[PDB]
From Swiss-Prot:
Tissues where this protein is expressed: Widely expressed.
Job of this protein: May play a cooperative role in NF2-mediated growth suppression of cells.
Family statement: Belongs to the small G protein signaling modulator family.
Domain SH3: 8-64
Subcellular location: Cytoplasm
Originating gene: Sgsm3
Entry protein name: Small G protein signaling modulator 3
Top-rank taxon, per record: Eukaryota
Portion of the parent chain present: 483 to 547 of 750
Lineage of the species this protein comes from: Eukaryota, Metazoa, Chordata, Craniata, Vertebrata
Length: 78
């Protein structure tokens, strides 16, 4: 249906209870949309209508491709 800007999403490997309001917590096996990756160590995603930093190591990156149309293969070795 609708369409717009698409970002990234990291899957939580374990439960992380944010200590500071700035820290973004999450439950084990939780999906969080990455908004601004402060750095290769500290990332900022979105969850429960919240936005805070968190250790990427605690979570895992996800690069999937759905509803793929614009891109496709055709003339392959013939």
């Amino acid at each position: 249906g609708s369409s717009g800007s698409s970002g990234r999403r990291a899957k939580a490997l374990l439960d992380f209870e944010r200590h500071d309001d700035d820290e973004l917590g999450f439950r084990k096996n939780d999906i969080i949309t990455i908004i601004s990756q402060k750095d290769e160590h500290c990332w900022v995603g979105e969850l429960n209508g919240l936005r805070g930093w968190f250790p990427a190591k605690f979570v895992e990156v996800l690069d999937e491709r759905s509803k793929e149309y614009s891109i496709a293969s055709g003339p392959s070795s013939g």
